[PDB]
Amino acid sequence: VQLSGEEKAAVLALWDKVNEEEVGGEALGRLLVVYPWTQRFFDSFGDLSNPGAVMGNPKVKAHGKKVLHSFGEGVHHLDNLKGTFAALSELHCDKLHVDPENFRLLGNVLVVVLARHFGKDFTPELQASYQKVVAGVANALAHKY
Amino acid sequence: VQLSGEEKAAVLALWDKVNEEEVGGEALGRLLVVYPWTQRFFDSFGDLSNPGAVMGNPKVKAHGKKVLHSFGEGVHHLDNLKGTFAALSELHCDKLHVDPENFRLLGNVLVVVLARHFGKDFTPELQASYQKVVAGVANALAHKY
Amino acid sequence: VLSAADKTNVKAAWSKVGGHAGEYGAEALERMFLGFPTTKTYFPHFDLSHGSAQVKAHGKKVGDALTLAVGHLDDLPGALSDLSNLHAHKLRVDPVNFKLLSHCLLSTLAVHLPNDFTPAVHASLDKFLSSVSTVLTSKY
Amino acid sequence: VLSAADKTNVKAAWSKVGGHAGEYGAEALERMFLGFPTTKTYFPHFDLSHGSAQVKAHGKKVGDALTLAVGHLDDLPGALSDLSNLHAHKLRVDPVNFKLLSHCLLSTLAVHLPNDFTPAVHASLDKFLSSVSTVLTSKY
Numbered sequence: 001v002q003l004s005g006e007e008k009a010a011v012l013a014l015w016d017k018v019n020e021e022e023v024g025g026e027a028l029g030r031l032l033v034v035y036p037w038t039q040r041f042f043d044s045f046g047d048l049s050n051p052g053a054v055m056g057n058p059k060v061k062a063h064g065k066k067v068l069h070s071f072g073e074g075v076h077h078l079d080n081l082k083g084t085f086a087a088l089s090e091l092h093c094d095k096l097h098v099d100p101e102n103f104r105l106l107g108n109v110l111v112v113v114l115a116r117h118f119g120k121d122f123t124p125e126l127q128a129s130y131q132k133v134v135a136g137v138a139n140a141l142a143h144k145y
Numbered sequence: 146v147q148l149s150g151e152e153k154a155a156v157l158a159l160w161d162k163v164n165e166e167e168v169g170g171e172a173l174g175r176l177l178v179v180y181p182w183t184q185r186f187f188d189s190f191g192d193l194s195n196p197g198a199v200m201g202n203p204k205v206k207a208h209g210k211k212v213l214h215s216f217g218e219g220v221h222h223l224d225n226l227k228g229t230f231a232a233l234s235e236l237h238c239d240k241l242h243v244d245p246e247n248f249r250l251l252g253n254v255l256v257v258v259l260a261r262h263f264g265k266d267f268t269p270e271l272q273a274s275y276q277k278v279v280a281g282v283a284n285a286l287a288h289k290y
Numbered sequence: 291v292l293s294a295a296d297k298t299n300v301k302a303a304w305s306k307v308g309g310h311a312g313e314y315g316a317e318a319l320e321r322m323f324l325g326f327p328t329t330k331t332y333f334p335h336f337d338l339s340h341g342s343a344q345v346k347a348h349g350k351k352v353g354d355a356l357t358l359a360v361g362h363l364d365d366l367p368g369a370l371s372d373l374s375n376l377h378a379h380k381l382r383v384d385p386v387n388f389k390l391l392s393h394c395l396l397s398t399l400a401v402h403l404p405n406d407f408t409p410a411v412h413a414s415l416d417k418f419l420s421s422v423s424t425v426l427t428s429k430y
Numbered sequence: 431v432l433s434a435a436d437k438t439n440v441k442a443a444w445s446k447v448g449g450h451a452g453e454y455g456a457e458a459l460e461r462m463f464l465g466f467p468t469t470k471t472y473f474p475h476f477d478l479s480h481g482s483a484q485v486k487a488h489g490k491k492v493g494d495a496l497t498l499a500v501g502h503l504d505d506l507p508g509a510l511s512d513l514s515n516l517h518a519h520k521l522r523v524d525p526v527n528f529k530l531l532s533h534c535l536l537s538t539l540a541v542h543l544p545n546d547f548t549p550a551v552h553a554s555l556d557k558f559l560s561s562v563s564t565v566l567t568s569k570y
């Protein structure tokens with residue numbers, strides 16, 4: 001939500017390199033494997049029995065991409081997070097009934113995935129900035145609860 | 146944060162009957178007994194070894210009263226929670242370094258204490274309204290983190 | 291429950307609950323549904339209105355199961371294994387909801403047993419309910 | 431750790447960590463301090479700057495203790511009893527901070543072992559770290 005000038009520039013530079021399809025699919029897939037109570041919300045995606053079935057499921061990849069695209073919007077609108085996610089907040093609370101703690105979980109999973117893809121380039125200082133973004137997004141999606 | 150007209154009236158009617166000294170002291174004391182890692186922040190209060198020492202400690206009662214008085218301000222300013230607690234948010238983050246999860250814990254402890262003092266008058270519907278207030282206060286104190 | 295003193299407190303407190311475990315169980319579910327509307331999602335097949343026969347009946351099941359555990363504190367995972375499977379594998383209950391029901395159960399006990407619900411007893415009851423919650427989410 | 435398959439995954443993953451446990455321990459502490467500044471409060475007596483000798487030394491202690499636990503999965507409460515007392519009774523560490531260090535440790539493992547850090551292994555490592563955290567906060 002509030003970065004320095006150097007921090008925003010670093011956050012944005014990393015985002016240029018993010019493949020929303022590979023990252024999104026991986027992040028969503030890991031969430032479903034590591035915290036398997038989240039699978040209740042995605043009953044319509046079919047077989048989510050085991051890690052192999054999850055990571056190769058086309059509905060997981062497609063929905064992951066959509067999540068990451070929405071994240072990208074937050075990254076490019078850091079001063080207006082609450083307005084950017086107002087409609088999505090409503091959807092998750094009113095229609096889907098997702099506990100807001102799960103937004104922090106997905107945010108952290110995404111950070112772990114970024115770390116996996118970028119390795120040493122994902123420095124302690126850069127992760128620190130990403131933890132700020134992730135928390136900002138989670139807070140903006142919780143606002144209409 | 147957002148109640149109906151009937152709900153606000155009920156919340157306010159209960160508050161007229163709240164003894165900020167008895168309730169405050171009890172709420173703070175229970176927090177220190179039930180979640181004893183919170184005692185780290187109150188080292189200057191002296192002996193907090195056992196439930197007897199905590200509940201009878203004058204610094205606990207005095208600080209509890211101050212907490213409840215501040216809560217009372219939120220209750221009478223439900224439309225401007227974030228502005229009412231902006232200074233207190235700064236204090237808890239910048240100076241005290243209290244994890245925001247502890248604000249939800251104290252809020253819930255306070256609800257349990259209200260339930261103990263008011264018994265059957267503290268109906269399921271009235272608790273539901275108080276859970277809203279408590280969460281609003283916790284969110285307003287977390288805002289500058 | 292965990293330490294000897296907590297086990298003593300928990301057995302003692304629940305003896306004061308006595309035959310009311312079912313009633314408190316139902317009241318706690320009601321407080322939960324109203325205070326935390328997300329939880330209603332797990333009960334689409336229930337009439338959720340006040341004094342509903344299903345809520346009353348289900349409250350009795352919850353109260354009986356907690357009574358079960360109080361008498362089996364030395365082996366909660368064994369006593370409550372059928373329920374671990376139901377809540378984690380079949381129902382996929384979000385672990386956060388256990389914390390919410392615990393809070394509502396403590397609130398209900400405070401309403402009905404204000405003189406018995408002392409700070410020391412509240413602390414042991416909290417640990418007990420957290421231990422029950424861990425067992426029920428242990429498949430996770 | 432908990433189920434046989436998780437114990438297998440955890441022993442296998444940590445064999446790939448090998449002699450680097452101390453280095454990763456230190457890196458994880460650094461990521462923790464920077465990402466979550468509240469945690470610095472527990473370390474007033476440390477030089478917290480990058481490549482600090484104290485952080486390096488303390489990282490080695492954390493890595494050794496996790497290595498301890500991996501070889502004692504069948505009895506974590508026994509193996510780590512000295513540390514339960516230190517973190518809960520003496521230091522009074524807020525349980526939330528264990529979740530934060532766990533996340534930072536997983537992040538550090540992802541950086542250094544990207545091919546070995548598969549979804550299945552990540553899941554077992556998460557359960558392991560949660561089990562270690564419960565043991566260390568068990569006095570609570």
Ligand code: HEM
Binds near residue numbers: 038102138
């Ligand atoms: C980082 C936080 C999150 C973001 C940015 C996000 C974003 C999105 C987006 C962009 C959509 C598509 C809505 C549309 O089509 O207009 C969506 C839908 C959905 N989300 Fe999330 N989401 C988040 C967290 C979660 C979590 C943690 C869950 C798990 C409960 C969840 C469950 C769902 C479900 C079940 C749908 C509907 C999928 C369908 O069409 O069947 N979301 N979300």
Ligand code: HEM
Binds near residue numbers: 187215236237248
């Ligand atoms: C419901 C949320 C809370 C409210 C409304 C609240 C309110 C207050 C108030 C009114 C003060 C007095 C500040 C002044 O003198 O101007 C204070 C200080 C303080 N608070 Fe909180 N508080 C809350 C939560 C917490 C929690 C959970 C902790 C535990 C870490 C905490 C720890 C402290 C400490 C250590 C002080 C300084 C006490 C001293 O003078 O030594 N607060 N808070």
Ligand code: HEM
Binds near residue numbers: 422
């Ligand atoms: C203190 C923790 C809990 C205990 C002791 C407990 C107890 C029980 C018991 C004994 C049953 C079996 C009823 C039967 O055989 O007919 C059951 C079922 C069930 N529980 Fe829980 N429960 C707990 C927590 C939760 C939570 C937090 C939720 C979610 C809000 C939940 C949702 C359900 C549902 C949906 C069923 C199936 C109901 C039906 O279809 O009849 N439980 N529980």
Ligand code: HEM
Binds near residue numbers: 472
């Ligand atoms: C995975 C969980 C953790 C493990 C395995 C662990 C391991 C250890 C070990 C082995 C020691 C003893 C060092 C010695 O004997 O000199 C220690 C001490 C200590 N730990 Fe932890 N720790 C964990 C979590 C935490 C967390 C989350 C915090 C708080 C941010 C923390 C704060 C401390 C502090 C302040 C000391 C004393 C340091 C000193 O004065 O030298 N630990 N830890």
